[PDB]
Amino acid sequence: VPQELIEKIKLISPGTELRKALDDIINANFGALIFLVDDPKKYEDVIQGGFWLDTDFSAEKLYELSKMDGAIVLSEDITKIYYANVHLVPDPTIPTGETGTRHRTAERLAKQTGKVVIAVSRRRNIISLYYKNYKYVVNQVDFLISKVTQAISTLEKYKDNFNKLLSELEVLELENRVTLADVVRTLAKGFELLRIVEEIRPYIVELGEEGRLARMQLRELTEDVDDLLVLLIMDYSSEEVEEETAQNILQDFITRREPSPISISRVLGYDVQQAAQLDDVLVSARGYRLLKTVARIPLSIGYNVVRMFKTLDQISKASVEDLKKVEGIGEKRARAISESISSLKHRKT
Amino acid sequence: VPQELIEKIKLISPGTELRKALDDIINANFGALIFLVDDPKKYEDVIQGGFWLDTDFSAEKLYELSKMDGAIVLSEDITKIYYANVHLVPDPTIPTGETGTRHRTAERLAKQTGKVVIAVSRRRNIISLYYKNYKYVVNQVDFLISKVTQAISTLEKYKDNFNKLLSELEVLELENRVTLADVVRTLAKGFELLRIVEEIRPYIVELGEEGRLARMQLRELTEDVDDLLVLLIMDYSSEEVEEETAQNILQDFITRREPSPISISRVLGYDVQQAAQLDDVLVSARGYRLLKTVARIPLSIGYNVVRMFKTLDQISKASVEDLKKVEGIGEKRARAISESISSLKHRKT
Amino acid sequence: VPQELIEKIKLISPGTELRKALDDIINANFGALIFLVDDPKKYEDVIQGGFWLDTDFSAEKLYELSKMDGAIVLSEDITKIYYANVHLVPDPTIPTGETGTRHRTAERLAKQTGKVVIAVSRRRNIISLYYKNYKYVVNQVDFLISKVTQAISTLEKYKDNFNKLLSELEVLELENRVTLADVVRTLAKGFELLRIVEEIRPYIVELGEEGRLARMQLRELTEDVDDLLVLLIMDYSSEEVEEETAQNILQDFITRREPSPISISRVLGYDVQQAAQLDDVLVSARGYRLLKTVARIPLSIGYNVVRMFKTLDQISKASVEDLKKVEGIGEKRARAISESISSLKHRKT
Amino acid sequence: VPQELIEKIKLISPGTELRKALDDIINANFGALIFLVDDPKKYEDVIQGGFWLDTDFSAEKLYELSKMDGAIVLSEDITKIYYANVHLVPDPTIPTGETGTRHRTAERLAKQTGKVVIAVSRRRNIISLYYKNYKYVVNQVDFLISKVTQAISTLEKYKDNFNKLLSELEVLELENRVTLADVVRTLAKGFELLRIVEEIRPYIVELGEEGRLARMQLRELTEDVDDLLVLLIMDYSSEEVEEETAQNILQDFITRREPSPISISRVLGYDVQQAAQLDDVLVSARGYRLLKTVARIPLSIGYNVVRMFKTLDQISKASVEDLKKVEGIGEKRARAISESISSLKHRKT
Ligand SMILES: Nc1ncnc2c1ncn2[C@@H]1O[C@H](COP(=O)(O)CP(=O)(O)OP(=O)(O)O)[C@@H](O)[C@H]1O
Ligand SMILES: Nc1ncnc2c1ncn2[C@@H]1O[C@H](COP(=O)(O)CP(=O)(O)OP(=O)(O)O)[C@@H](O)[C@H]1O
Ligand SMILES: Nc1ncnc2c1ncn2[C@@H]1O[C@H](COP(=O)(O)CP(=O)(O)OP(=O)(O)O)[C@@H](O)[C@H]1O
Ligand SMILES: Nc1ncnc2c1ncn2[C@@H]1O[C@H](COP(=O)(O)CP(=O)(O)OP(=O)(O)O)[C@@H](O)[C@H]1O
């Protein structure tokens, strides 16, 4: 969904004066045919008849002008109403896949001029927007809120299961009993959770102002999940990896690649073939996840701690004095790490 | 609900071009009478008048043809529109339980020809589908989403209570203090939970594309519940039972048998008569549930471990060396079992 | 809301053939005036004109007969349609508080004859039922489901807070650090929770078949709450009390009395005046709640255990041998009590 | 939103007889123009024609009078209907921003007379209320319930995250490992949570009777949150602060100031500039939060305990005898504090 088109779609999104008028028009069962031009002078040949207005835009004006037949002509920035009641005459040899004169006209004209054309039928309560060769249908808020509410509910359940997986893995991590299965399983649920988010984003966008609460709900459900998955990947990849690499793996099981168990493990540097094999692969976390998240050690200095101790299991045994021997951590960070890890082990075991 | 009928119902399910047209037709308060034929030549005697079209199907075409009186005739695969505006003349001595000419015609014709006949009244917003001797009413998405959302909410609350029961039983299992009451109670809630799922499945099906999120929500709520109940049954049945047997018991308190306390215990091999008696019946888990779920030991090799130690209580005491004496578990699986059980006992006690 | 009236209301509740017809009638904006008689012969003087039918009832018939003006006459059991298109002529000197001829007629006739009269206006989508001197408005399912869904959500939040209170009190109970404030607070939330349930019950009833899922949701949210509050009251009342007494106290803060802190404590046998005073009142549970709920000791034998040890704190210290000295508990129940209490103390402390 | 206006808005809020009539009027697509006067004699010059009624108000009467053209005139207390079918003639030189004669009339008249004028269009289902120079649009319950339900869902997710933050901080507080980051983070989420509540309050108000359940849901979600944040602020401010001061800080990140990390810490008496700096700032709670909340020690006497021991870490080490040396706490309060803190440390560590 190209961003040029996305700019256009915000023109008719909930919260704009234009959408308020369109909403009223829909509610009244007037139709609508709106041509978004910037230099009205130049479209002289596709505009016939009607009334030259050159007046300031407003929702009420647009509404009232919609009671008349034919099309209305607006400035691209929706600040001026140029014409009402016009007959729009695009080239009829232009191919169109639309039904009925209103939408065939709108599609042809949008392709011929590269401008925006908005079309609303009298009966159907749907806003179709034609721009160049695109066509985007904009839904009513009723419909959007319902799909978004379903999705957020869906997200909740993924998040719960992700939290269960994660706290289970936490026990295993502190006890150095982690298998590749435990990691891959946790990652997969995280990946799926963020995917759902990706899938619903266009709806959130289509909701405009009306999607303020949904945006907040998403953010609460997912805020630290990206960072968390990136740290898991860093901690359990077969060979070490920079933040940026891991960050790109995350980026990908969310978009280009589907996250199957075998897929994730292979991408993690493990040569595996079958499901049942993952339970037999033992792995130890380098310790980045707890160092950043719990010990609040910058991932900057994290590497230093890892390169000295290699794994979280070692780090958990290090004395303050031992830990202090690392560069990037002094007296304060030493106690932060040992007390963090010591506290977690005594509480989750 | 026969599967032949089920195939037919997906023809008009959300996501098909046909349903999109039907939806628009409903919204416009046109009626509809649609005859799904494959060899139009052969129904010459039940089709009079109207227009021979033989044109490619589309939702917009079907919509427009619906503005006219009478019936429309489609190919069974919904790729061709054969007729519009026809008078359909089925045998009127065929018994019908329908009201008004449209639905009496549809029922009679569907029985006479064994084909599909779709009928939509102008006022009522409901799709009736007649096929042979069946009649299936298809609901609007509005109505389906509401019932499904209620059911998922219902499921949530069953799942919570099931989780509470289960984690309570977990304590009891690790401490070898389990009574038949604790088991039967846990099982019953699981059974009821899966039943609700069974009850709502037709609605999920009727939702078609529009039920993608509900499917995902169900799966998250229930994924490992079947396996879990099967393992409980295996662990607490009076005499030992194969996976397949237990799997069939589960299959049944979900469908053919209602899961009362006494019922479940009797089916579990315990000769009991009264409720209050179950609290006095002491039972010990063989250990399959934790061996598979937590120790990630294949149920294959599980039996071997059980047959040697008889119960989870024994298994929890076995040394690695002891455990290693079992066939099917080596050095890795030994530590997996003892560390698993050791970890759970120290955390839940 | 008298039960005679309640029987009548189920006549038009979701799931009945009558309601299905009424629903369709509402959707069509026909009006309706329905007179529920058993001996049509005897109402000769309040029924003029129209058509004598004496036909079997059905929803479709009732619908079709509703297209005509005037009233329809049914048998009380809704098995026969006696008249259609009649003019109903009740005594006009009977006082009525209704507007417009349809509802004035319905109210007067219902009072004059003590029978049921159903009235539906063409515009408004509401079912009014007159019977004797009663008038009950029945709402659409749309409206009911929304209020019930709000209430269940409300209930959820009360239940969560009740669970938090309760598990907090559990810690305090095991450590013998309970004050009257802790008890009263817990009880109050329980009382409020069950009250909400009481408040919504008429809506659940009005929902008929359509309220199956809401009934299940309520039951899951509240199943063991009554028993739990009754046990709290038994455990923390100033003087000992039978089950039945406590059961009646519960029954009352739900209905006749509003449950303020001071109120509940005074009803609990504590002479208190001010809020802040409750924190200073130390109390110890007799131990009924854990004996029944956790030790699965019948409240029958519970008393015996209490009368010997007086409090849960004592009971928690008793040896098996000590406990066995009680009548009603043998070897099995002794270990059940000591292991129960021992397990809880080690897990919640 | 001035309170004079707020009084007026409750006139047309769900639950009033007036709103019931307005609702019916909307449902019937009658328009409405209602003038709320107390001394009808004095508005002789802005009221022409129509019928002098001087009758008692009722919803049904108002409805019926709405079938006629023109305006209706009511007493300010909505107890009398004075006129119907009148032509209202306000000064037309009064500036108005409304469209169409009904709403231009209503705005002008409301400004000219300082009285209330209610206007309802035939098509649009919206109630506009003009009073003096104000204009308030009142929404349908449908619309309000949807926004409120979204907000409560939003609140839930903030509350969960706030609870997680808080219980995490609890561990840190008992172990004396708290940094300014931990405090500021917790506070911020609390602040944001109460803000959302502030944002939705007008909707709750607009819901009138129909917002009983939403009010209860809010109260359950937020009851002890204000007190909790006030105690955090008291416990972690750089210099000591009275209840009232802290209570005013809370009051402010909810309203006048946006709660950024740096903002909150600076307002907390810490001279910080950058985000990353907060993790390095070590802080110890004075102990007010646990003393009040858990030890149920009045904040009155709290200060005394603090001024002697300075921090929660000290207090946690004090003997009963030590603690008893404080004024305001005797034998009972000593054991309350040491047992409280002792219990929490053993359970959360
Ligand atoms: N080239 C054109 N220029 C200006 N206005 C046009 C136009 N083509 C159509 N319209 C306007 O759209 C009206 C008819 O378009 P239709 O395709 O029939 C939309 P509709 O009738 O509302 O859809 P419907 O099928 O859901 O009822 C015309 O009467 C006209 O006012
Ligand atoms: N044998 C038949 N063949 C073709 N079309 C038929 C038909 N019988 C009925 N129809 C179509 O259906 C129309 C009337 O059927 P009705 O039973 O009255 C449905 P309706 O009027 O929409 O239901 P309603 O009672 O909810 O208003 C006819 O006018 C016709 O166009
Ligand atoms: N005594 C009576 N006997 C039989 N039918 C009656 C009746 N009184 C009224 N009716 C039926 O009800 C119709 C008018 O009643 P109204 O009070 O106007 C209901 P309505 O018009 O649907 O309510 P509305 O104000 O919402 O529009 C009459 O035309 C008649 O068919
Ligand atoms: N000064 C005035 N005094 C009394 N009544 C007035 C009035 N001005 C308008 N009205 C009433 O309002 C009616 C027309 O007002 P409109 O602005 O057209 C509201 P509407 O038509 O319902 O809005 P709409 O644009 O959504 O359709 C008049 O016919 C009149 O009955």
Side-chain angles (χ1 to χ4, degrees), chain D residues 127-327:
Chain D
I127 313 178
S128 318
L129 182 146
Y130 303 86
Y131 173 59
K132 306 193 174 195
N133 296 319
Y134 309 101
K135 169 185 184 164
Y136 190 96
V137 158
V138 160
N139 305 276
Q140 212 92 20
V141 169
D142 193 331
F143 168 85
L144 290 178
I145 288 306
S146 176
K147 304 289 295 179
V148 148
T149 297
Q150 278 157 83
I152 294 176
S153 270
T154 300
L155 260 185
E156 270 174 53
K157 291 174 181 71
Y158 276 71
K159 186 58 189 307
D160 283 295
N161 278 350
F162 176 76
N163 286 332
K164 283 164 190 287
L165 282 173
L166 196 36
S167 75
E168 181 55 36
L169 183 70
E170 167 174 281
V171 160
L172 303 183
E173 191 165 288
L174 294 157
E175 298 183 358
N176 207 9
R177 297 165 42 213
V178 178
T179 73
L180 188 48
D182 301 309
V183 174
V184 167
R185 184 139 49 230
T186 295
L187 285 179
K189 181 113 312 172
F191 289 151
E192 292 179 330
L193 185 168
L194 297 182
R195 244 162 191 272
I196 293 169
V197 176
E198 287 307 314
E199 292 189 7
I200 206 58
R201 176 168 295 116
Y203 294 79
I204 296 296
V205 168
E206 281 196 41
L207 270 168
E209 284 280 309
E210 281 303 314
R212 180 163 198 271
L213 290 175
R215 289 168 179 276
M216 301 169 123
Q217 273 177 101
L218 280 216
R219 176 178 180 163
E220 293 308 288
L221 273 184
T222 69
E223 49 185 3
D224 296 311
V225 172
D226 55 337
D227 293 349
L228 212 155
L229 294 163
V230 170
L231 288 164
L232 282 179
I233 300 162
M234 288 190 57
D235 265 4
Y236 287 109
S237 61
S238 196
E239 293 177 350
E240 211 148 340
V241 294
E242 296 78 8
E243 198 178 356
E244 288 207 5
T245 304
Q247 237 161 18
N248 291 148
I249 305 193
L250 164 65
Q251 173 52 42
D252 202 57
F253 281 100
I254 297 182
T255 63
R256 119 181 75 94
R257 190 144 329 282
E258 280 283 343
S260 75
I262 307 301
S263 185
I264 300 175
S265 41
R266 296 206 68 81
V267 170
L268 275 180
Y270 296 103
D271 176 25
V272 321
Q273 307 83 39
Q274 197 206 322
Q277 301 209 0
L278 296 183
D279 292 288
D280 298 319
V281 172
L282 273 35
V283 301
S284 286
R286 307 182 158 83
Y288 290 120
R289 214 184 82 240
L290 301 195
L291 272 178
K292 194 188 177 199
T293 289
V294 175
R296 284 170 282 171
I297 297 299
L299 212 55
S300 176
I301 292 88
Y303 302 110
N304 306 18
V305 180
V306 161
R307 217 145 21 228
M308 166 163 333
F309 296 91
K310 303 290 221 164
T311 69
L312 172 87
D313 181 69
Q314 290 308 319
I315 305 175
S316 68
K317 290 157 183 170
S319 81
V320 170
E321 311 312 320
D322 298 337
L323 281 177
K324 255 181 302 192
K325 233 139 163 56
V326 186
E327 175 208 53

Side-chain angles (χ1 to χ4, degrees), chain C residues 61-276:
Chain C
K61 288 184 185 183
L62 176 66
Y63 174 78
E64 202 68 29
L65 292 167
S66 284
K67 298 182 175 174
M68 295 187 291
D69 280 335
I72 296 170
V73 181
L74 308 180
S75 64
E76 296 182 0
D77 57 20
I78 321 306
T79 59
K80 290 262 180 172
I81 311 173
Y82 288 134
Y83 296 89
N85 184 236
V86 303
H87 181 201
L88 295 177
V89 280
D91 187 357
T93 59
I94 296 183
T96 171
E98 298 304 317
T99 299
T101 68
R102 189 196 305 278
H103 291 262
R104 294 167 83 66
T105 294
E107 187 165 64
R108 291 185 164 140
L109 179 71
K111 289 160 136 199
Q112 184 172 325
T113 69
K115 293 305 177 174
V116 172
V117 191
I118 298 142
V120 177
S121 280
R122 298 175 218 96
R123 287 168 194 275
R124 311 172 223 256
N125 292 254
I126 222 52
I127 313 178
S128 318
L129 182 146
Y130 303 86
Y131 173 59
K132 306 193 174 195
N133 296 319
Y134 309 101
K135 169 185 184 164
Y136 190 96
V137 158
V138 160
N139 305 276
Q140 212 92 20
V141 169
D142 193 331
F143 168 85
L144 290 178
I145 288 306
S146 176
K147 304 289 295 179
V148 148
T149 297
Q150 278 157 83
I152 294 176
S153 270
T154 300
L155 260 185
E156 270 174 53
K157 291 174 181 71
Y158 276 71
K159 186 58 189 307
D160 283 295
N161 278 350
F162 176 76
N163 286 332
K164 283 164 190 287
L165 282 173
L166 196 36
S167 75
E168 181 55 36
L169 183 70
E170 167 174 281
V171 160
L172 303 183
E173 191 165 288
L174 294 157
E175 298 183 358
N176 207 9
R177 297 165 42 213
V178 178
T179 73
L180 188 48
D182 301 309
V183 174
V184 167
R185 184 139 49 230
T186 295
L187 285 179
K189 181 113 312 172
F191 289 151
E192 292 179 330
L193 185 168
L194 297 182
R195 244 162 191 272
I196 293 169
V197 176
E198 287 307 314
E199 292 189 7
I200 206 58
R201 176 168 295 116
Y203 294 79
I204 296 296
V205 168
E206 281 196 41
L207 270 168
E209 284 280 309
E210 281 303 314
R212 180 163 198 271
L213 290 175
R215 289 168 179 276
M216 301 169 123
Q217 273 177 101
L218 280 216
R219 176 178 180 163
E220 293 308 288
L221 273 184
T222 69
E223 49 185 3
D224 296 311
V225 172
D226 55 337
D227 293 349
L228 212 155
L229 294 163
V230 170
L231 288 164
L232 282 179
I233 300 162
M234 288 190 57
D235 265 4
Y236 287 109
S237 61
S238 196
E239 293 177 350
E240 211 148 340
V241 294
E242 296 78 8
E243 198 178 356
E244 288 207 5
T245 304
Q247 237 161 18
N248 291 148
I249 305 193
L250 164 65
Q251 173 52 42
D252 202 57
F253 281 100
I254 296 182
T255 63
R256 119 181 75 94
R257 190 144 329 282
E258 280 283 343
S260 75
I262 307 301
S263 185
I264 300 175
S265 41
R266 296 206 68 81
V267 170
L268 275 180
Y270 296 103
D271 176 25
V272 321
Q273 307 83 39
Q274 197 206 322

Side-chain angles (χ1 to χ4, degrees), chain B residues 33 69-71 86-88 100-102 105 121-124, chain C residues 63:
Chain B
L33 193 52
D69 280 335
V86 303
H87 181 201
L88 295 177
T101 68
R102 189 196 305 278
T105 294
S121 280
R122 298 175 218 96
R123 287 168 194 275
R124 311 172 223 256
Chain C
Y63 174 78

Side-chain angles (χ1 to χ4, degrees), chain B residues 160-312:
Chain B
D160 283 295
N161 278 350
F162 176 76
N163 286 332
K164 283 164 190 287
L165 282 173
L166 196 36
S167 75
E168 181 55 36
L169 183 70
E170 167 174 281
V171 160
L172 303 183
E173 191 165 288
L174 294 157
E175 298 183 358
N176 207 9
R177 297 165 42 213
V178 178
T179 73
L180 188 48
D182 301 309
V183 174
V184 167
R185 184 139 49 230
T186 295
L187 285 179
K189 181 113 312 172
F191 289 151
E192 292 179 330
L193 185 168
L194 297 182
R195 244 162 191 272
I196 293 169
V197 176
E198 287 307 314
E199 292 189 7
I200 206 58
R201 176 168 295 116
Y203 294 79
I204 296 296
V205 168
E206 281 196 41
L207 270 168
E209 284 280 309
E210 281 303 314
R212 180 163 198 271
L213 290 175
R215 289 168 179 276
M216 301 169 123
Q217 273 177 101
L218 280 216
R219 176 178 180 163
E220 293 308 288
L221 273 184
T222 69
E223 49 185 3
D224 296 311
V225 172
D226 55 337
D227 293 349
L228 212 155
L229 294 163
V230 170
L231 288 164
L232 282 179
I233 300 162
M234 288 190 57
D235 265 4
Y236 287 109
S237 61
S238 196
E239 293 177 350
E240 211 148 340
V241 294
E242 296 78 8
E243 198 178 356
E244 288 207 5
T245 304
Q247 237 161 18
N248 291 148
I249 305 193
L250 164 65
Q251 173 52 42
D252 202 57
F253 281 100
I254 297 182
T255 63
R256 119 181 75 94
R257 190 144 329 282
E258 280 283 343
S260 75
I262 307 301
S263 185
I264 300 175
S265 41
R266 296 206 68 81
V267 170
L268 275 180
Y270 296 103
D271 176 25
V272 321
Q273 307 83 39
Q274 197 206 322
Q277 301 209 0
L278 296 183
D279 292 288
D280 298 319
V281 172
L282 273 35
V283 301
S284 286
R286 307 182 158 83
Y288 290 120
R289 214 184 82 240
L290 301 195
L291 272 178
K292 194 188 177 199
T293 289
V294 175
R296 284 170 282 171
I297 297 299
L299 212 55
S300 176
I301 292 88
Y303 302 110
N304 306 18
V305 180
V306 161
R307 217 145 21 228
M308 166 163 333
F309 296 91
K310 303 290 221 164
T311 69
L312 172 87

Side-chain angles (χ1 to χ4, degrees), chain A residues 24 27-28 30 60 63-64 67, chain D residues 29-33 46 48 66 68-72 85-90 99-106 109 119-125:
Chain A
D24 280 333
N27 193 261
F30 309 155
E60 276 307 303
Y63 174 78
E64 202 68 29
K67 298 182 175 174
Chain D
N29 291 125
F30 309 155
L33 193 52
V46 290
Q48 313 180 334
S66 284
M68 295 187 291
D69 280 335
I72 296 170
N85 184 236
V86 303
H87 181 201
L88 295 177
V89 280
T99 299
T101 68
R102 189 196 305 278
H103 291 262
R104 294 167 83 66
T105 294
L109 179 71
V120 177
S121 280
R122 298 175 218 96
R123 287 168 194 275
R124 311 172 223 256
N125 292 254

Side-chain angles (χ1 to χ4, degrees), chain A residues 29-33 68-72 85-90 99-106 120-124, chain B residues 60 63-64 67:
Chain A
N29 291 125
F30 309 155
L33 193 52
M68 295 187 291
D69 280 335
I72 296 170
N85 184 236
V86 303
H87 181 201
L88 295 177
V89 280
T99 299
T101 68
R102 189 196 305 278
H103 291 262
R104 294 167 83 66
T105 294
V120 177
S121 280
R122 298 175 218 96
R123 287 168 194 275
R124 311 172 223 256
Chain B
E60 276 307 303
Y63 174 78
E64 202 68 29
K67 298 182 175 174

